[PDB]
Amino acid sequence: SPKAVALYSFAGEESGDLPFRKGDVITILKKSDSQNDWWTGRVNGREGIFPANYVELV
Ligand SMILES: [Cl-]
Ligand SMILES: [Cl-]
Ligand SMILES: [Cl-]
Which of 17, 22, 41, 52 could make an SS bond with 26 (beta carbons 3.0 to 4.6 A apart)? Predict the structure, then answer.
């Protein structure tokens, strides 16, 4: 499974969003062919979707 580092924090205020802080390493559960889409991941015991541009694939 791909991992990615958060370049910026995401508050993830909407239901289904995955919040994270800058520097967190997110486990990617689903990605698309664009890093401008919302991808699916998990970190900190939460699961959800987030803007893929906020992360850098390891
Ligand atoms: Cl935000
Ligand atoms: Cl892209
Ligand atoms: Cl969750």
Answer: 41
In CATH, what number is assigned to the domain containing residue 57? 2.30.30.40
* CA 38 to ligand 3 centroid distance, Å: 16
- Whole-number Å distance between alpha carbons of 54 and 46: 17
Segments forming the whole domain that contains residue 13? 1-58
Are the C-beta atoms of 4 and 25 separated by less than 8 Å?
yes
Domains in the chain, number: 1
Non-local (6+) Cβ contacts of 39 within 8 A are 28, 30, 31, 32, 49, 50, 52, 55
Q: Is 50 exposed, middle or buried (0-12, 13-18, 19+ CB in 10 A)?
A: buried
Residue 49 Cα to ligand 3 middle (Å)? 10
